Amino acid sequence: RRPPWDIARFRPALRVAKLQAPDSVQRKDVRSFPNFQADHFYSENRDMVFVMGGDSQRSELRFLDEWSVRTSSTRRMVGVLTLPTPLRGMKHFTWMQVAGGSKGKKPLLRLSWHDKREQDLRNTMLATVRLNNKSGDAGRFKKIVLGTRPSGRFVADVRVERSRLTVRLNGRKLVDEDVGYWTYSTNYFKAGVAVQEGSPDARVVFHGLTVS
Ligand SMILES: O=C(O)[C@H]1O[C@@H](O[C@H]2[C@H](O)[C@H](O)[C@H](O[C@H]3[C@H](O)[C@H](O)[C@H](O[C@H]4[C@H](O)[C@H](O)[C@H](O[C@H]5[C@H](O)[C@H](O)[C@H](O)O[C@@H]5C(=O)O)O[C@@H]4C(=O)O)O[C@@H]3C(=O)O)O[C@@H]2C(=O)O)[C@@H](O)[C@@H](O)[C@@H]1O
């Protein structure tokens, strides 16, 4: 295992993100990558690997650029990645998002993996598009099934511009939504592993990741 920063094709994305993980694992969000590796963030097989367990706990890049949905310049994140079979006890983790930041509060989008959902689906991937930024019973969502977890790599490609949000998975446009009601100006991408519910370690393996 070696520092991810050793793999040059990860450097452009590393230069415009910081790595968030729990307070127990890191004093400060990581901003300097050369030489850095830990159990939660390392490179094996030339890939950049995030590993975290515990509900709410994350090992996730937080991209520093912040924008509104109305933006004329595309914001886009594309990842080539593998979700290895999760361990029994791992229920729900998020491997890409559009975070709503300080004004939005809640994520506009989460791309997540789930042991079980009903919409009876097992081992299934979800895009959740928030219809408002509200908590608990008051929140409204569009939940878009993304299908079964690929057993090997796949490509996820998230875009927003001019109030349109899309997500392509291996080229197929599975999410295509007007997000103009989401007026907040503090959105930004993240990628990695953020565990919603699960005690065992989840691991998310990136073969490439670029933002633009
Ligand atoms: O299945 C279900 O149970 C339901 O899921 C519902 O989606 C929920 C999720 O399950 C998660 O609870 C999700 O949690 C969000 C949380 O609501 C915030 O939006 C949070 O935002 C954190 C940011 O990502 C970022 O880390 C930010 O960093 C600050 C921080 O102060 C930090 O210390 C650092 O130093 O500096 C930064 C910064 O850089 O700005 O903190 C934000 C924070 O509030 O802590 O992100 C989590 C997350 O994991 O994404 O919320 C969603 C949701 O939509 O509410 C929903 O799908 C529902 O249908 C299901 O039934």
Author numbering: 27 to 145, 149 to 241
Sentences from the paper on this structure:
For the product generated by PyAly, the trisaccharide content was approximately 21.9% whereas the tetrasaccharide content was 44.8%, making tetrasaccharides the main product. Notably, residues Q (from the first conserved region) and R (from the second conserved region) formed interactions with the C-5 carboxyl groups at subsites +1, +2, and +3, respectively, based on the structure of PyAlyH125A_Y223A-M5 complex. Interestingly, although the bound oligomeric substrates for PyAly and A1-II’ had different chemical structures, their three-dimensional orientations were similar.
The overall structures of these PL7 alginate lyases are similar, showing a β-jelly roll fold composed of two antiparallel β-sheets with a deep cleft. The noteworthy structural differences among the solved PL7 structures are the loops around the deep cleft, which are variable in length and sequence and involved in alginate substrate binding with the deep cleft. Structural study on several PL7 alginate lyases reveals that two loops around the substrate binding cleft determine product distribution.
